[PDB]
Amino acid sequence: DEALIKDYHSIREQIDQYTKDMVLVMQHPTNCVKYINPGRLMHVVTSDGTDFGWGVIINFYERRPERNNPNPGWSPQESYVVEVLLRLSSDSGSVDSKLKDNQCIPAGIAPVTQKNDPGRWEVVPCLLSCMHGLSQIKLHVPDKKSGGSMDDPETRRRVGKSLLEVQRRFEDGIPHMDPIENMHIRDVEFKKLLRKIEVLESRLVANPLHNS
Amino acid sequence: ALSYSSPLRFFRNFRFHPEFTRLVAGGWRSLTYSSRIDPDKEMCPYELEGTQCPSGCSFQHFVDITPAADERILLELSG
Ligand SMILES: [Zn+2]
Structure with missing residues (x-):
């Protein structure tokens, strides 16, 4: 069911993109030097x-x-x-x-x-x-x-x-x-980023390929 | 079947995952998700070396961060 394979990997691609966005924020000096x-x-x-x-x-x-x-x-x-x-x-x-x-x-x-x-x-x-x-x-x-x-x-x-x-x-x-509880990263974009990853994860498991 | 590891699996909110029991061997009692680690204390160097702390040793020890054991707690409650 090739339309459904294309959706599954589309989600994974979006999660990969948001995952490098998230990592960049936590590596940013103004967000982590306090904890180095x-x-x-x-x-x-x-x-x-x-x-x-x-x-x-x-x-x-x-x-x-x-x-x-x-x-x-x-x-x-x-x-x-x-x-x-x-x-x-x-x-x-x-x-x-x-x-x-x-x-x-x-x-x-x-x-x-x-x-x-x-x-x-x-x-x-x-x-x-x-x-x-x-x-x-x-x-x-x-x-x-x-x-x-x-x-x-x-x-x-x-x-x-x-x-x-x-x-x-x-x-x-x-x-x-934890970026929020331990590092208190305040960025509103970062807050949205972690929710975007969660809702996409809920989308991804909704797909038959996950357990197929 | 196809498997995937969340980039959020090491963060605090991963404990609210419905399958959390399934994917972390230790469950809620796993030290990896303990809520008792003071991130500004140092772990005891004597403990890790395996040599006996001096009296009053105020480094962070493993007993400080390990959850209570329900067997000891069910014990204390009776009588
Ligand atoms: Zn000690």
Whole structure:
């Protein structure tokens, strides 16, 4: 019933479009820098879609362009860098700490992809454009005047392994920050966006293909 | 049959989904949807290490965010 297949995918397309609209709002700096707190967990995913999993926010700074490139055309979500502790594959190379004008993450790193690969916990710089979750969970991390630092590889493996203890304890997944109840995103367009997604979801399940 | 994961499944209102029991293994008692996490407290580093907190430890602990267990509560009510 080809008319009915075309409707089903039309809905899915609309939900995909509204879903990237929604993600953009929550990545926008004016809506999230308040919650980019050292120790809060952050799910890092590249635009191409490689998933680095959850990591620990260590620092965040405003991005500065190169001397030869005054107007690099960054978006607001590409205009800030979060330093995140991530578990990289032991395979993965050396972590270059500064991103070039065209990179969202360093060039030579990848997530863990093989079992009996423990990984290596490294601090990695990421654009806000790669942020696909902020947790309600905060781990304790050393700071200035607390006498520790994330430069010590052994401290990185200590904090790193507690984050895997948190995820082990959260069987059903790490708990996300709610855009309304936790971040108090006031935008009227955003309010309509989440309702639009819900009513479309009700439309989509109404379709036979959902259970066919 | 065809399956799809809502982009709203990690947000608070997902608990009002009619199939919520079906798609989250833990149900309402799942820590993933606990209403008891203080987003500005830090989880206890001793607890996660598996070493015993000092007395009076005021980090956020898992017992703080885990719902009450109805078996303990049905227990207390009698007598
Ligand atoms: Zn403790």
